[PDB]
A paper describes a structure:
The SARS-CoV-2 papain-like protease (PLpro) is a cysteine protease and a domain in the coronavirus nonstructural protein 3 (Nsp3). Conserved across coronaviruses, PLpro, along with Mpro, is responsible for polyprotein processing, which is required for the generation of a functional viral replicase. In addition, PLpro functions as a deubiquitinase/deISGylase and is thought to modulate host innate immune pathways via cleavage of the posttranslational modifications ubiquitin and interferon-stimulated gene 15 (ISG15) from host proteins as an evasion mechanism. As such, PLpro is hypothesized to be an essential viral enzyme, and PLpro-targeting antivirals may offer a differentiated mechanism of action compared to antivirals in the current therapeutic landscape.
A crystal structure of SARS-CoV-2 PLpro in complex with 4 was determined to 2.59 Å. This structure reveals that 4 engages a region on PLpro that overlaps with the substrate binding site but does not extend to the catalytic triad active site. Compound 4, like GRL0617, binds in the pocket formed by the flexible BL2 loop and forms critical hydrogen bonds with Asp164, Glu167, Tyr264, and the backbone nitrogen of Gln269, as well as π stacking interactions with Pro247, Pro248, and Tyr268. The catalytic triad is shown in magenta; a catalytically dead construct of PLpro (C111S) was used to generate the crystal structure. The C terminus of ISG15 (His149-Gly155) overlaps with the binding site of 4. Last, rigidification of the scaffold via introduction of a geminal-cyclopropyl group in lieu of the pendant methyl substituent resulted in the lead compound (PF-07957472, 4) with an additional threefold improvement in biochemical and cellular antiviral potencies and also a reduction in the apparent intrinsic clearance (CLint,app) in a metabolic stability assay using human hepatocytes. Here, we report the machine learning–driven discovery of potent, selective, and orally available SARS-CoV-2 PLpro inhibitors, with lead compound PF-07957472 (4) providing robust efficacy in a mouse-adapted model of COVID-19 infection.
Residue numbers in the entry: 3 to 315
Amino acid sequence: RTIKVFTTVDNINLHTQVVDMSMTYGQQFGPTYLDGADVTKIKPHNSHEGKTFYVLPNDDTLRVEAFEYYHTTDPSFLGRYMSALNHTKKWKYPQVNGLTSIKWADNNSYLATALLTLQQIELKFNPPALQDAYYRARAGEAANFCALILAYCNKTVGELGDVRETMSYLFQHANLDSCKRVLNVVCKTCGQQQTTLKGVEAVMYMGTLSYEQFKKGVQIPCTCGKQATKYLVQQESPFVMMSAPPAQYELKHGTFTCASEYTGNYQCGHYKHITSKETLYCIDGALLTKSSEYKGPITDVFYKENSYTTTIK
Ligand SMILES: Cc1ccc(N2CCN(C)CC2)cc1C(=O)NC1(c2cc(-c3cnn(C)c3)nc3ccccc23)CC1
Ligand SMILES: [Zn+2]
């Protein structure tokens, strides 16, 4: 009982291997990886026929090099990255409206939306190999950056993803120490409670798409049971990301940087990227659509920032 698959050690040369289905990939090839997953302790599936597997034997110098260059301690990182890279190298990366995008394939709508957003926000990555991949992605060659996004998010090629979760994971690898957010929460029976958030917690919010509604005050539930009002007191970050579950929202030109439109059910839909240039543009992978006004199911909105201070007494 066998299947025929392809193995690779360099992502350039493929070798047809006949694999025995009664043994795991590990006992036949050593550390084996497929589309961003570790298949070492897994027995071959019928679906694996014709697929390309990355083989990466265990070397202690590789593990140490991964900590220094990728900033990871997961011994499967390199193999998951290399195996995902085999697939992301097969994708097309068109320049849509001056930005590097990804032509739709293997449910990568979320990857394209994240990639297009990353080109419009001031960000510097701490892992040296991630920052190098980021520079190359901005210049057009984005296959390595995409494989690293899948690797840092623990995702596989073909598996749908959330743009907000992807951003959350990537921001943990960005230098956001100088980012600061001061919030005040007011409950009629609890009082006022000021909170100071730093790093990723200072640039992301879940509950509303409007940065103006956040500045004015938003209704959140309090630990007492009553409703409280949370509002933005101070903000010191180069950008802000306001997210909420997909809902019909009106995007007015020049009021935001870029946004993520999500159409369809939870974990079933498709992403489109809306960006505010001289007019509103909608980048749907390799497709582009102009428009003066916009209303659709938005789930993420990014705004520009330097320093904000509330005028609320
Ligand atoms: C595409 C995808 C892949 C993967 C994961 N997960 C997220 C949870 N991780 C732990 C595993 C991966 C989610 C989505 C996803 O659908 N995320 C979004 C989303 C959609 C709706 C939604 C849309 N229509 N309807 C009826 C509901 N509700 C939401 C509520 C809260 C938050 C997000 C919601 C569009 C942001
Ligand atoms: Zn309270």
